[PDB]
Amino acid sequence: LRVGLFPVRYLVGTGLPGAPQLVLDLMVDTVDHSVVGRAAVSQAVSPPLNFHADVWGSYVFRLAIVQISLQGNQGGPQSNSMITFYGELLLKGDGKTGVASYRYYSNGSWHEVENVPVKAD
């Protein structure tokens, strides 16, 4: 409801057959430097991976990287559900490309995807 917000969609992954794919639909508040949105992790493997989380975090600019830290769960930050997602995006300063790592919880275990490409749109 305040002026300072914009959306952005990031596709995180190598894009290789059978590789994990993370889609982040993010809201960015350029005043408080805060971020909120959704994470979806899928993989065209057998069985199908359909992981989802409400995510939140913040961004920081260092001179040129824009670093976005995210964590997530079922419901968001006011929910007391366990954190099931952590992500760190190291985007180039234009906010359109970069590298990312993340960890997600599924089937009683953590799964980590490290240093994969990031693109917007």
Numbering used by the authors: 5 to 67, 78 to 135
From the paper:
The Q63NT7 protein from Burkholderia pseudomallei is 212 amino acids in length (molecular mass 22.5 kDa). It contains two predicted domains: an N-terminal domain of unknown function (14.5 kDa; DUF1842) and the C-terminal domain (DUF1843; 5.4 kDa), which tends to appear in multiple paralogous copies within individual bacterial operons. The N-terminal domain was predicted to fold into a β-barrel composed of eight antiparallel strands. Polar residues are found covering the exterior surface of the β-barrel, while the interior of the β-barrel is lined with mostly hydrophobic residues, without space for a channel through the barrel.
Q63NT7 presented a challenge for obtaining large, well ordered crystals. We also observed inconsistent crystal formation across our replicated crystal trays. Even so, we were ultimately (after approximately six months) able to optimize these conditions and grow larger rectangular-shaped crystals that diffracted beyond 3 Å resolution on a synchrotron microfocus beamline. We collected data sets from these crystals, which we refer to as form 1. Diffraction data indexing revealed the space group to be P21. The highest resolution resulted from data collected from a single crystal specimen. Efforts to phase the highest quality data set (form 1) using experimental techniques did not lead to immediate success; selenomethionine-labeled protein crystals did not diffract, and we observed no heavy-atom signal in the diffraction patterns of crystals soaked in caesium chloride or potassium iodide. Form 1 crystals gave a combined LLG value of 719, form 2 crystals gave an LLG value of 394 and form 3 crystals gave an LLG value of 305. Because the form 1 crystals gave the highest resolution diffraction data (from X-rays), a model for the β-sheet-rich domain was refined against these data and then subsequently used as the starting point for model refinements of the other crystal forms (X-ray and electron). Final refinement for the form 1 model gave an R factor of 25.1% and an R free of 28.7%. The backbone r.m.s.d. values between the experimental structures and the AlphaFold model were 0.35 Å for form 1, 0.49 Å for form 2 and 0.46 Å for form 3.
